[PDB]
Every structure is written in structure tokens, then in C-alpha cells.
């Protein structure tokens, strides 16, 4: 292995091993509201995580992921720009070494404390190996943590934090609910980019919501307590794990708002 978000092998260097991280449709962006054209051809979006069911939460040394049960027809996301059904697989988060930076998608040229990605495949392709080699193979459901009130349902997983602290760790992670993790409103921008980790592929339809959620600062410093080492190996806090801002190039961003 190698790559991270290290000073040697950080965002700057990743286009070496993966050459399409310098490509024409790469995220995250910045989002400039001047430039993002409202799209009435958009519809709502359609949240269904009534039946995600959540399995374990995994440090993996870059983030820690909560993994869901994708066998089933269970959470799905569908509409807004999307055609088909997409189903929720995992999601994770990026967060800074302070509040004033951390987010991966910027709001004219703001950024948040945090960025939460709900990561999705189109059941068209059958399972999420062969979904993410395809351009419309994963939506993201991308959604920015602004620091302020606690959001209780992000509770539970700061919670267990503790017991996930270093690389390799794993917890038990059933009977969560995302839809704790949901802002009021479902606006959003959306336009076609990355994965925002090697390999890079140019495989997800973004869908980034207007709306940021809440969450006090004891919750997300409790984000920054994880390590990017596995035990037993010296201590390297795991922050500032997001890629920047990368060029927009021959690309779009809708607005499904006025
Ligand atoms: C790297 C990317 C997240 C990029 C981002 O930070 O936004 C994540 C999102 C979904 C992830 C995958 C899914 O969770 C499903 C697989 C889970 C396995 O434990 C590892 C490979 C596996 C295939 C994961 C690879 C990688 O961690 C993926 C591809
Ligand atoms: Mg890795
Ligand atoms: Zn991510």
C-alpha cells in the first residue's frame, strides 16, 4: 500500500499511482453558486432508509466506514438526477485538524468541519464491484457537519469511537439509522465527478445538499481522537483526511432549488 494524506503521500502525489486522479471529471469541487444553474428537470430526491440495516463500523486507516447490509432492495436512494435504484453500501466522513476546515465539496470557496458521504451503487450492475468501474455505477449523497447544536442521532457513532481508535479496529454497528444523519431539506447541487480516494473513478453522480447539519464540537472532536496507525505502531491522529477542491473543467453544477 501507500497512499494517504501525508505531505509524501497525500492528494498532490496520488496521480502517480492513479493517473486518472489528474482526470476531466474529478471530485470533490468547489461549488459556485454564481455558476450553478438551476435545473427544473430535476425531481425530489428519494431517501429510503427506513429499512438500511447497518452491520459493523470499521477504522480503516484513511476513515471509519459503517457498512450496511446491500443484499436487499432495503435503503435505496432514487430520483433527483438519478435513473434507477441505488443502494446505500457504506458511509464515512472527512474532517479537519480544527473546525475552519475539513469538508472536501466547498460552498464559494467556504468550508466546513466535516463532510459526511453516503455512498451508493446502481443495482443495474448487480453489486458495487462492477457499479464503480461504470460512469452512472455510484450516487454519493454528500452533506457538510457545520459546528453548533449536537446532532443526537450522530451520537452513537461518536460513541464508539473509542473502541475503533486505531487502524484495523472493528466494532459491532447494528440498529443505526442514517436517517438521524439527514438535514431538514433535501436541496441540493449535483453534477458528475469521482470517488474522492484512489482509485478515483470517474463513476458518481454527486448529489451534495444544500443544507448542512449540526454537530457540537465535543461530537466531532471526538472524530480526531481516531488514528491513522494501526496498534502499537507511534501515534498519527487521523485528521485532515479530505482532498481538496480539484478543477472543474468541462462541467455543470445543477441546482435542484431556485
Ligand atoms: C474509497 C471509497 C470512498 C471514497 C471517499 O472517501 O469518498 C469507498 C466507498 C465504498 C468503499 C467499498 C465498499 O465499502 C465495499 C467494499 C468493502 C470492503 O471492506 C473493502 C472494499 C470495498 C470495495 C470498499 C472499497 C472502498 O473503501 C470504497 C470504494
Ligand atoms: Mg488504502
Ligand atoms: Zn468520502
Known amino acids: 500500500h501507500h497512499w494517504g494524506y501525508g505531505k509524501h503521500n497525500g492528494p498532490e502525489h496520488w496521480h502517480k499511482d492513479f493517473p486518472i486522479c489528474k482526470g476531466e471529471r474529478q471530485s470533490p469541487v468547489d461549488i459556485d453558486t454564481h455558476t450553478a444553474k438551476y435545473d427544473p428537470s430535476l425531481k425530489p430526491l428519494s431517501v429510503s432508509y427506513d429499512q438500511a440495516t ?42 479537519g485538524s480544527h473546525d475552519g476546515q475539513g469538508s472536501e465539496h466547498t460552498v464559494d470557496k467556504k468550508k466546513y468541519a466535516a463532510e459526511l458521504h453516503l455512498v451508493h451503487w446502481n443495482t443495474k450492475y448487480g453489486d458495487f464491484g462492477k457499479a464503480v468501474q461504470q460512469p452512472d455505477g455510484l450516487a454519493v449523497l454528500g452533506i457538510f457537519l457545520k459546528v453548533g447544536s449536537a446532532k443526537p442521532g450522530l451520537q452513537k457513532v461518536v460513541d464508539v469511537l473509542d473502541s475503533i481508535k486505531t487502524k484495523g479496529k472493528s466494532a459491532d454497528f447494528t440498529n443505526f439509522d442514517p436517517r438521524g444523519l439527514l438535514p431538514e431539506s433535501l436541496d441540493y447541487w449535483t453534477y458528475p465527478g469521482s470517488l474522492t480516494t484512489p482509485p478515483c473513478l470517474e463513476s458518481v453522480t454527486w448529489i451534495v445538499l444544500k443544507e448542512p447539519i449540526s454537530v457540537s464540537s465535543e461530537q466531532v472532536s471526538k472524530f480526531r481522537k481516531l488514528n491513522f496507525n494501526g496498534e502499537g505502531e507511534p501515534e498519527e491522529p487521523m485528521v485532515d483526511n479530505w482532498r481538496p477542491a480539484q478543477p472543474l473543467k468541462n462541467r455543470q453544477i445543477k441546482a435542484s432549488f431556485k
Open 54 to 95: 447497518s452491520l459493523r463500523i470499521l477504522n480503516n486507516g484513511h476513515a471509519f466506514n459503517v457498512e450496511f447490509d446491500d443484499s436487499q432492495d432495503k435503503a435505496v436512494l432514487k430520483g433527483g438526477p438519478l435513473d434507477g435504484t441505488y443502494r446505500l453500501i457504506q458511509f464515512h466522513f472527512h474532517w
